[PDB]
Design a protein around this ligand. Structure first.
Ligand SMILES: Oc1ccc(-c2cnc3ccc4ccncc4c3c2)cc1
Ligand SMILES: [Cl-]
Length: 342
């Protein structure tokens, strides 16, 4: 009469509570071993992420913990919420897998990005990312790794960020949206995520990853090629070694934003589209700014004409979410186990 049951999903076996049924592979949108499921209890589809032996290595355990802990703690419309967490195992000993249940959206930004550019939709989404991002920031959380695959949205355009990005600190690492200061290993501040949002917004318009690269090298060139070489102030912030490589790169004036994001990528009928196209590029221009010292901030971005319309004080001025010590496998198992056991 066990309350759990195992269901083979893809090459994974999800052993979840009976309430969760019709488990199915989310697909490419799966940020981990995640699958779609129907929560009989809540009569709501949910995404069930499975973490097999999270405590195995260090980094992972730490991240999985931080994630789980934060996800529980945060409660914001644009940050994936934790519908429920559990493990089939009944003891720390037996403990192996952790299943995070969270609302299931209908698509992630990758998908959305491929949709015909709509200003209300793009505007709303962006507003929503800034929001989430703002909430994260207001908690000392600076994502630094915002990407279309880790942001999902419902049909009603509700946008939610899946993970709490990097923690104060490259295989299968979508670096296409990492801010320059990150890529180039410089320090960073909140506006480091504005870059990520710029890349996304631009991509929504261009429909092509703005800065594709087989690695960071190509990326940087694609960056500079389009946004032009950064100012010496930026260079100077570069580690001696890096700065050397970067500064010795081919000098690019960089394409203007009107050219980076032509009018043909935007609606042309209404003057509304004409203005919005202009605002879009404007915003983009303020986000897709190599030098974070010169890059627009979340509040300013939020107050930008393009996002302006959705601005809701209550949402934006929502109070921050209610550690960083290393551990050992055996120690992380407990921490995580307890957290799962609440
Ligand atoms: O085609 C797609 C593309 C993406 C999703 C989708 C929707 N919601 C969610 C919600 C939480 C998630 C947590 C971790 N990984 C993926 C998703 C997820 C994925 C669903 C269908
Ligand atoms: Cl610059």
């Amino acid at each position: 009469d066990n309350q759990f049951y195992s269901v083979e999903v893809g090459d994974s076996t999800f052993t979840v509570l009976k309430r969760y049924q019709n488990l199915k592979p989310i697909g490419s949108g799966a940020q981990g071993i995640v699958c779609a499921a129907y929560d009989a209890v809540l009569d709501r589809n949910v995404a069930i992420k499975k973490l097999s032996r999270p405590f195995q290595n260090q980094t992972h355990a730490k991240r999985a913990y931080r994630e789980l802990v934060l996800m529980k703690c945060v409660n914001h419309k644009n940050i994936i919420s934790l519908l429920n967490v559990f493990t089939p195992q009944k003891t720390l000993e037996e403990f192996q897998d952790v299943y995070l249940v969270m609302e299931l959206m209908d698509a992630n930004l990758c998908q959305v990005i491929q949709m015909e550019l709509d200003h209300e939709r793009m505007s709303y989404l962006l507003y929503q990312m800034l929001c989430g991002i703002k909430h994260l920031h207001s908690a000392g959380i600076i994502h630094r790794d915002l990407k279309p695959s880790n942001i999902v949205v419902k049909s009603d355009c509700t946008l939610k960020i899946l993970d709490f990005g990097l923690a104060r600190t490259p295989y299968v690492v979508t670096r296409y949206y990492r801010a320059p200061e990150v890529i180039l290993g410089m320090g960073y501040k909140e506006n480091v995520d504005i870059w990520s949002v710029g890349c996304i917004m631009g991509e929504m318009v261009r429909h092509k990853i703005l800065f594709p690269g087989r690695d960071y090298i190509d990326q940087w060139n694609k960056v500079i090629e389009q946004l032009g070489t950064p100012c010496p102030e930026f260079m100077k912030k570069l580690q001696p070694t890096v700065r050397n490589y970067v500064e010795n790169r081919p000098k690019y004036a960089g394409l203007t934003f009107p050219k980076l994001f032509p009018d043909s990528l935007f609606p042309a009928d209404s003057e509304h589209n004409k203005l919005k196209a202009s605002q879009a590029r404007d915003l983009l221009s303020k986000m897709l700014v190599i030098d974070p010292a010169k890059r627009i901030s979340v509040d300013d971005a939020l107050q930008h004409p393009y996002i302006n319309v959705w601005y809701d004080p209550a949402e934006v001025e929502a109070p921050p979410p209610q550690d960083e010590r290393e551990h050992t496998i055996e120690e992380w198992k407990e921490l995580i186990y307890k957290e799962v056991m609440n």
